[PDB]
Amino acid sequence: SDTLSLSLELLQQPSVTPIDHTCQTIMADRLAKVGFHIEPMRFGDVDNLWARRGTEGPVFCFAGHTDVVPTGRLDAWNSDPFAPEIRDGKLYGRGSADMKTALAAMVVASERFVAKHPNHKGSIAFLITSDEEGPAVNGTVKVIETLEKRNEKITWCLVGEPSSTHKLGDIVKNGRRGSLNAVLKVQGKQGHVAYPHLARNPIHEASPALAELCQTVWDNGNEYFPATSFQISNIHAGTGATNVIPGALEVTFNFRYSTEVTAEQLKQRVHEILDKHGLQYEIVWNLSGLPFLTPVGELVNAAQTAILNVTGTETELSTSGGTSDGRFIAPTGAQVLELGVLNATIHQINEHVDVHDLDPLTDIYEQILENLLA
């Protein structure tokens, strides 16, 4: 499996956002040998790659990221997350599902495709970033900004995110809910634990609020998007002393919202709940991504037939899960479709992917090239 060997090379590079750690170079060196122009695009602390074979339309673009989320408790892993290994037909390692394996399949499919169909029409392109998981202010958004400024349009973009639920290709995504982040800093007053009346415990004041937020029903979603969901990712207060009341509480949370609400409606409803609990705080909001929905067209069609032909599965469209760089690509007018491995273990400890899906996914991606460009 050429996909497996390339997967391992990428998986061995520790690439926690926004580190690339040679990943885009490894890819570029492959692509450069099969007629792709290599155009790296550094933006601050982020590395990006625009690779393109052909100068005429239509333009098919494979999108993805080389960065991975933090590993977590290193002693909770059964094997080093940056030392990939197979164990009972399962490939373990951070990025094994989200999404270094897809990256590899896109490259091998591209190579195999160019070999059997060298005089194909249109162009094939790769838009790869090293900051998709984080702020994403210097990633794919800046690449698009550059492409748009020189009128370089993408017709079809297939983001190799892990779209599947139960079996490979059972789900493909043409849209996504929005993503709204917040860092809440609740102010109290540092003091002695045995003299709470002379202090303000932020953990105590915020408790009822966090409890309320966690149970609050935001919307019921709609026929295109699941309901808005609330999640607290981080919470911190205190430095260690058991007899000291902390002066502040930091709470980091996020909304994945449907088109039934706007970032502004959510913000206002959240301040309204914090005000209701008589809190003294400050929030720093950040709109990570807008809800988006691209049209169902030939990319969806090419993918329905490729999936059915490789796996015998009837795929189903969805906007579920997280979001992707498709939010920065969709505004250009390209049809966006996400297709990858199972998302069962993404961002989890002992993240893995079934080896039996690597070659199929590679084949699926190859056949999509054939249906759209030959």
Q: Given the rule CB under 5 A, which residues bind Zn ion? A: 98-99, 133, 161
- Four-point Cα dihedral 241, 242, 248, 249, nearest 10: 120
| CA-to-CA separations, 71 to 45, 67, 129, in angstroms, rounded | 20, 12, 19
Q: Site mask, a copy of itself, residues 322-351, x = CB under 8 A?
A: xx-------------------xxxxxxx--
Least distance in angstroms from the C-beta of 153 to a copy of itself:
29
Token reading at 120: 């194909």
Nearest to 255 by CA among 208, 282, 287, 296: 287
224 CB-near residues (< 8 Å, 6+ apart):
175, 258, 259, 293, 319
Sheet holding 352-354, edge to edge: 85-86, 90-92, 352-354
Task: Choose, by CB under 8 A, the member of 107, 157, 184, 245 that binds a copy of itself.
Answer: 245
67 is catalytic: yes
Least gap, CB of 75 to a copy of itself (angstroms) = 12
Is residue 69 near a copy of itself by the rule CB under 8 A? yes
User: Cβ distance 117 to 374 under 8 Å?
Assistant: yes
Smallest distance from Zn ion to CB 324, Å: 6
Can residue 211 be called a binding residue for a copy of itself (CB under 8 A)? yes
Q: Please state the closest distance from residue 201 (CB atom) to a copy of itself, in A.
A: 6
Question: Which of residues 194, 223, 272, 312 is near a copy of itself by CB under 8 A?
Answer: 194
Residue 256 pairs with which residues in a beta bridge? 179, 229
Q: Which residues are catalytic?
A: 67, 132
Binding site for a copy of itself (CB under 8 A): 69-70, 72-74, 76, 133-134, 177, 179, 181, 189-196, 198-199, 201, 203-204, 207-208, 210-211, 214, 229, 231-247, 249, 252, 254, 256, 288, 321-323, 343-349
